[PDB]
Design a protein around this nucleic acid. Structure first.
Ligand SMILES: [Mn+2]
Lengths: 241, 244
DNA sequence: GCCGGTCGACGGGC
DNA sequence: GCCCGTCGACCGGC
């Protein structure tokens, strides 16, 4: 995390700003103004990577520029989009992209999401399944010291016509207890939580985090299958008889 | 249906119209219907505001819920205790993008819920209704024998890009209750949404609406059982090896 | 709050 | 095209 060591600073600049989505642009702005050389939006990182490798043409070749199957899986775009890419056909911000912001330096990747809220309902974080896949690849490729998925919550309060930042929170996914992670299966299998109160006491490595998270996903997967029978089958059986 | 009879007209008018998202086409259908079927044509929050406004005596969520005279229709169109509780002429409903129906058409205690879909040409099949929402609707239709009360219909607006602007090329009309229920594709991960292309929706179901409900509920259940099972191969089987 | 279902829009494999 | 995940934004019952 390149953000933790300057989170003091980020908090204080964010506290008192006024406009809740417009808030993440102020996080980007600040980070770009202060960590310029390592601050990227995801489509921007991809553009930079590919521009800097003009000889690397076509999807299969460019897929090799990541030299990480986990990072190829989290950060890369699809075969065709990676094929059709050129200096005249650059990538553009897409919501479907994994990270709000990318911070990279000395081969380390900090995937960062900004979450904005008033004072209610837990946002989508990542597909529980997409995470399981991330973990599997981590473990398979022993990529335990490559990336973090961290979060920044901007808490705002209404004010006339303005919205004002009351406070900020920061959390690191790999510092959380995997089993405390709420999975909303129906809602695109999205892990949901508020950054402000995501547990931060996990005392293992990313390897132990990945194993522990796979245990949780597998567990909940089993639990959902069972829950589906109780919720979606049993009650409706009486109408077929 | 109140638009089935006038569809060649909505089709007449829409085809050939330019727009400089694809969504503003929904805007043109609403304008057309509001003008040619003024009293029937709503938008779920309009009807909601309307139903309550013309009943100033009826106050609070329970009393207002009675206004619907239909468990099944309540389910579809209602806004929940607090929203219904704090509704007034100084706190009217506004359209939410997670309401049931884009457009509501109503005459003589009959309801036509109309969704508008818009598209290019070989696009993703869009969300229709939560398979589970529909499962509850059907059950409610049956528990309460409400088989002649509402239809769920769709209008598809096909556009092609023409330089800066989009030009309506064709349109489609289809009825959910005329589709063969067992053909309805349920995308479980994506909010349990049944997805289909309106244009391709088959319309050869011949039976009571009851038979459609019973037949839908057969599909939903079969599909649910299959999904739960498939979670084991999709989400358990591949990750077991990682358990230490 | 916690839980979890709903509508939208889109990617992206084959 | 079909299949079906992934990210947004949201509701609304306890
Ligand atoms: Mn975001």
């Amino acid at each position: 995390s390149f953000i933790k060591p300057i989170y003091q600073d980020i908090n204080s600049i964010l506290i008192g700003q006024k406009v809740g989505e417009p808030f993440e642009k102020l996080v980007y702005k600040f980070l770009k103004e202060n960590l310029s050389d390592l601050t990227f939006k995801q489509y921007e990182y991809l553009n930079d990577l590919f521009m800097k490798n003009p000889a690397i043409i076509g999807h299969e070749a460019r897929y090799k520029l990541f030299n990480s199957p986990t990072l190829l899986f989290l950060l890369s775009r699809g075969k065709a989009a990676t094929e059709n890419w050129s200096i005249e056909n650059l990538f553009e911000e897409k919501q479907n992209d994994t990270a709000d912001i990318l911070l990279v330096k000395d081969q380390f990747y900090e995937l960062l999401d900004v979450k904005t809220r008033n004072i209610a309902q837990a946002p989508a974080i990542i597909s529980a399944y997409k995470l399981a896949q991330t973990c599997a690849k981590m473990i398979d490729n022993k990529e335990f010291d490559l990336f973090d998925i961290n979060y920044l919550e901007v808490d705002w309060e209404l004010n006339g016509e303005d919205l004002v930042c009351v406070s900020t929170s920061f959390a690191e996914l790999f510092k959380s207890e995997p089993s405390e992670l709420y999975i909303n299966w129906a809602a695109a299998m999205q892990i949901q939580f508020h950054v402000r109160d995501l547990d931060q006491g996990f005392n293992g490595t990313r390897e132990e985090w990945a194993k522990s998270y796979l245990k949780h996903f597998v567990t909940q997967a089993e639990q959902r299958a069972i829950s589906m029978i109780d919720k979606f089958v049993k009650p409706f059986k009486k109408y077929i008889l």
